[PDB]
């Protein structure tokens, strides 16, 4: 039963090792993309404020 469980573990874990490497890569990419999107939104808001002050002046 113990060999059985060891087998189970190895299998699943090597599966979760691959899954966690993929998750690290994907989460890094997704968080970087979210940061870039937030930066783009901030710059768009800055340009909107610039245009608004230009129109006000």
């Amino acid at each position: 039963a113990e060999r059985e469980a060891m087998l189970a573990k190895t299998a699943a874990d090597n599966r979760k090792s691959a899954e966690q490497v993929a998750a690290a890569q994907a989460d890094y990419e997704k968080e970087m993309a979210e940061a870039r999107a937030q930066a783009s939104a901030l710059r768009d808001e800055a340009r909107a404020a610039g245009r608004s002050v230009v129109d006000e002046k």
Partner: protein, 50 residues
């Protein structure tokens, strides 16, 4: 004594037969099985480590 010597020679012949033709294969099987056990142990090891 003669009976003892004869049966002892027969035992020696059968022992030689098994040691030269039956011991080798069984032994392999035991080693190949051990290979497996150690391997599985170490593989669990690496999967957990990885």
């Amino acid at each position: 004594m003669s009976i003892f010597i004869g049966q002892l020679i027969g035992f020696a012949v059968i022992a030689f037969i098994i040691v030269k033709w039956v011991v080798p294969p069984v032994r392999t099987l035991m080693r190949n099985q051990q290979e497996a056990v150690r391997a599985a142990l170490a593989e669990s090891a690496e999967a957990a480590k990885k």
